[PDB]
């Protein structure tokens, strides 16, 4: 007997908080727009993939060799043009760190070809890596916390769904890159923040 993935469905209710993606941009986004974010999921050959269109950005993030599929995402706009993305899969069936690939491509304002491409090492326990590539000059900062131990208090979960998140520090992962000569500052203010659940899937 082996513990496997669950079959796909139209509406998933058991969500696991997998990632906190925190793109900072250099163009003006003033507030969270209701019904703005649009996500597309795929689970092909043990690779989870989510494509997020919204707030002038498209995020193509895939996780390799997982028994998880992306089922939900919530996007929110903080102060100083920061974009926080909360991602949710089905369930954590393995306690191993997974390799991550993020493609951040700029839909409007500053658009271009491959500005950046690197492998960001995992900050704590150094087990995994994040192949990041940025198509455009519209990104100041990227912060990705894989399996965080804390939800954002400004994110309200739907009443009919159930939320689970990591509780162990050993499963935490941090990836970060800055292109502006300021230490850190990728983090959100978390003062006046609102999240919107993305539309599809």
């Amino acid at each position: 007997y082996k513990n496997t993935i669950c079959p796909p469905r139209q509406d998933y209710r058991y969500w696991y908080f997998v990632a906190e993606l925190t793109i900072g941009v250099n163009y003006d986004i003033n507030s969270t727009i209701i019904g703005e974010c649009h996500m597309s999921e795929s689970y092909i050959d043990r690779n989870a993939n989510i494509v997020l269109t919204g707030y002038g950005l498209k995020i193509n993030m895939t996780i390799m060799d997982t028994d998880q599929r992306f089922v939900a995402a919530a996007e929110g706009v903080g102060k100083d043009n920061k974009l926080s993305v909360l991602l949710f899969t089905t369930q954590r069936l393995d306690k191993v760190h997974h390799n991550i690939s993020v493609t951040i491509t700029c839909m409007e304002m500053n658009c271009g070809t491959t500005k950046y491409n690197s492998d960001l090492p995992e900050s704590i326990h150094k087990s995994s890596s994040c192949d990041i590539t940025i198509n455009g000059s519209c990104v100041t900062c990227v912060n990705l916390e894989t399996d965080p131990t804390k939800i954002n208090p400004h994110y309200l979960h739907p009443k009919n769904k159930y939320l689970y998140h990591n509780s162990e520090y050993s499963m935490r992962g941090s990836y970060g890159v800055t292109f502006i000569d300021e230490l850190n500052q990728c983090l959100l203010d978390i003062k006046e923040l609102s999240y919107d659940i993305c539309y599809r899937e």
């Binding site: 090492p121 900050s123 704590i124 520090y169 890159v177 800055t178 300021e182 230490l183 850190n184 983090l187």
Partner: protein
């Protein structure tokens, strides 16, 4: 996590293994609080004080050989967990390579 002792001098180590064996000359080495205020900032070997918060202003010292920040004049307020972040500054983009979280109880 790693903790420190009472009201004499706190030692917060990064414990960077440095598996790539790269030098400190191109490395952004800094510390921060649970409320995310910068303690020290080593940019390319020179300490930068512009982003250091006024609460820890002129209070922290840094040891490059042991990679350890010494916090002096412990107070009752600073019982939070302190995390050290090590970026690797590259001209194409600055990449965080290491982070660690230590605790501090006095």
């Amino acid at each position: 996590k790693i903790q420190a002792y009472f009201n004499e001098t706190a030692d917060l180590p990064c414990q960077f293994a440095n598996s790539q064996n790269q030098s400190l000359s191109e490395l952004v080495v800094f510390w921060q609080d649970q409320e995310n205020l910068v303690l020290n900032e080593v940019y390319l070997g020179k300490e930068k004080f512009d982003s250091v918060h006024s609460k820890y202003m002129g209070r922290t010292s840094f040891d490059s050989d042991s990679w350890t920040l010494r916090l002096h004049n412990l107070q009752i307020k600073d019982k939070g967990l302190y995390q050290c972040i090590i970026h690797h500054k590259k001209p194409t983009g600055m990449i965080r390579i290491h982070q660690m979280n230590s605790e501090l109880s006095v």
